[PDB]
Amino acid sequence: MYVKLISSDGHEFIVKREHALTSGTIKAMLSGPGQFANEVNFREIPSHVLSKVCMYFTYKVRYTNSSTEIPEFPIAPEIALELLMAANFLDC
Template identity: 55%
Template sequence: MMMGEMSQGQREMQSLVRAANATARAQGSMEPVTLVANDGTEIIIDRRAAMVSGTIKSMLAGPAEYSESLQNTIKFPEISPQVLEKVVQYFYYKMRYTNHPGHLPEFKIEPELALELLMAANYLDT
């Protein structure tokens, strides 16, 4: 697969993220949080999905002196947009399948993202 091409699994996960956000917006229950990658790319997700991360949860639910809790925007100067997108996909995967009975679908990770994703997951406490 060439760089920039998406696998079927990636397309399915992006579809899952879009559908979850659309459902939350339609129900009026979406509290948006903006995650900003190192190149300025912004990804808007539901606050509930963001709270999968222990680090983000601390920033958003912590004392009001955290600017992130006031602005609902979190910048990640060390995380690329590709890795941040995969992290967001995992947040929604985790939300959907936590306490899910039965077989869980595989969460696919592209080998070229594995090391950066591991470092991001460690920092984000996911």
């Protein structure tokens, strides 16, 4: 029910798996012999951007076709390019 994400920095983030399955790439990575039983490690992603990605997961989870205005997702200026890069490899 809970899945572990390990960044290249070394920090480990535990997340509800129903949240994590939003991104197709993670779903495909779990599929296959690596059934892991879970924990997942990325050799190149730094911790902070992956934390922002996790916050994106939970923020999308909170509001789905929800009524009224949806609060915008704050973006830091420098990390914008890194987020654009990291969008592909997770395909969220």
